[PDB]
Amino acid sequence: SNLCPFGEVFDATRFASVYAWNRKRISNCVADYSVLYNSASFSTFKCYGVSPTKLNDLCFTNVYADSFVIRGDEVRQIAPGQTGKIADYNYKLPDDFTGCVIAWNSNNLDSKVGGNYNYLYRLFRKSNLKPFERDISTEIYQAGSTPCNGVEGFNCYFPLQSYGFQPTNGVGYQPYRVVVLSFELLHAPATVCG
Amino acid sequence: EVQLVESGGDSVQPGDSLRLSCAISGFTLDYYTIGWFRQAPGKEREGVSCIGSSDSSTSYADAVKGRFTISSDNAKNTVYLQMNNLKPEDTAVYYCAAGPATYYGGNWHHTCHANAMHYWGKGTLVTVSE
Amino acid sequence: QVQLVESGGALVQPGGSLRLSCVASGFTFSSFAMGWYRQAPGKECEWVATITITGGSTNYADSVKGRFTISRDNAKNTVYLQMNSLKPEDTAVYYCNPDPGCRRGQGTQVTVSS
């Protein structure tokens, strides 16, 4: 019936580290969004700017899906007008965000015993990110007056940090997989669509 | 489930020497970074020294190079910090912290900042006077 | 900003029932999916129950499956947790949150003791 490839985003074997978050465009497919907001397998499911029960009745130009992995705490920050390490240095939604933030516990996949170190987040940066900007830089962060010259040291940090997920932690420290649906409404009179 | 206890802090005089101890109790982390940080009254909690599980390499702040030394007995699961030629400006609360190491492009990174620690001890006073 | 006020918790005897509640403010409730979590002294925060935006589907934790029920009233910005056949192991501070974690709101204390 030409259904949208939602499974490809949600059920991928591996997700991207939040500093290098992955982005997929959905197009040329009929999408039933209810099969997402009626699933209780998503522990958190947040919508801004739009009414979820009216998503199948709206007209979009663009539809983006950003996937990545963070920890339970930081899901707070995937929202308009939030602060903190993730919202400031990794992934920021603008205040006029119109879309939805879906996140679910991925303890049994992304947390191994002794730590899973493949998931990194950016821990130092000289300035905050603009909304929907991603940085994948590896430049050394100068925290002191002594210049760095690209050499890591006590005052010159590597800018990224592993999570080191372990399944025994509490839920706030446990890995959560996140998908952000971003929408682009069609400009039209209301007799046409909205 | 994971605890860090500091010992050895007291009140000494300039030039004296102290040894601080940290008792490891519960580490499952395969690759980690252990460190001593210090907090002055009112100022910010800054880093003193660190040792990373990979390479077992030692890192020291500028203010303490040659005077201080960090070491570990992984057998006994303890981490020691020797402080020689103590100065009045070394007076602070000393915390034992630890965290995961960072893994990028095959290499391991052991940055020694408080923002990169997930486990903290309670601390112990060191005071240098008279 | 955001406010999450939980309530309803008291001391019940084993086997008993309890209906916990919380009221949310600071965001369009009708449009968020809500979860319940619990934190026990000397233990870590764990997830208890999840309910969809519409309340149509519900997911539960294996330690409470069959004994607990999560519900939602959008007209009152309130979510409810009915707790049946209470074990002593359910004694903890209970929190409600659209995001993961405990301690966001003040929570409410539930003590199952005989």
Side-chain angles (χ1 to χ4, degrees), chain A residues 41-57:
Chain A
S41 56
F42 306 129
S43 75
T44 59
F45 197 88
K46 295 186 285 185
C47 291
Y48 306 87
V50 293
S51 179
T53 57
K54 316 224 163 187
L55 284 176
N56 298 328
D57 311 315

Side-chain angles (χ1 to χ4, degrees), chain A residues 77-122:
Chain A
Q77 313 191 35
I78 315 305
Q82 301 294 104
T83 187
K85 297 296 182 181
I86 299 314
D88 295 344
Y89 303 153
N90 288 268
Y91 184 91
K92 189 157 182 63
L93 306 163
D95 306 345
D96 74 316
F97 176 64
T98 79
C100 297
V101 175
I102 315 162
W104 71 95
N105 188 4
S106 68
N107 204 14
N108 46 15
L109 317 177
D110 299 308
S111 54
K112 91 186 287 275
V113 159
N116 174 8
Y117 303 86
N118 304 332
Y119 284 135
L120 315 165
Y121 68 94
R122 176 174 309 282

Side-chain angles (χ1 to χ4, degrees), chain B residues 15-124:
Chain B
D16 284 0
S17 167
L18 273 177
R19 200 173 82 166
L20 300 202
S21 302
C22 186
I24 304 300
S25 162
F27 262 92
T28 62
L29 285 153
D30 283 348
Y31 307 87
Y32 54 81
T33 309
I34 320 291
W36 294 91
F37 298 70
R38 69 189 175 171
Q39 175 85 81
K43 285 144 65 69
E44 184 184 345
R45 174 170 320 181
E46 68 178 7
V48 193
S49 178
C50 278
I51 187 168
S53 68
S54 290
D55 204 19
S56 293
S57 65
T58 53
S59 182
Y60 298 89
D62 297 324
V64 310
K65 269 188 208 270
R67 308 158 59 231
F68 296 181
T69 294
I70 192 171
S71 67
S72 57
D73 191 13
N74 285 331
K76 192 174 184 183
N77 275 305
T78 58
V79 187
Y80 299 126
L81 175 67
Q82 181 90 343
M83 295 182 296
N84 297 319
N85 310 328
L86 285 170
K87 295 204 184 76
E89 60 258 44
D90 299 321
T91 291
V93 175
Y94 284 64
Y95 306 91
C96 180
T102 315
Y103 185 64
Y104 186 86
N107 304 327
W108 286 99
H109 301 257
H110 296 282
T111 67
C112 189
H113 196 90
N115 300 352
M117 305 295 145
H118 193 248
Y119 291 115
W120 285 94
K122 327 157 186 188
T124 179

Side-chain angles (χ1 to χ4, degrees), chain C residues 31-76:
Chain C
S31 193
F32 278 66
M34 291 288 159
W36 275 97
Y37 303 80
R38 72 178 174 206
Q39 169 80 86
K43 293 178 180 178
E44 309 268 24
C45 182
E46 69 174 359
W47 165 75
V48 179
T50 299
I51 183 168
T52 73
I53 281 161
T54 67
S57 296
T58 46
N59 190 2
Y60 301 89
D62 285 355
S63 66
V64 305
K65 270 206 189 287
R67 303 190 295 118
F68 285 13
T69 287
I70 182 173
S71 60
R72 153 205 287 271
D73 183 29
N74 310 271
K76 196 55 182 175

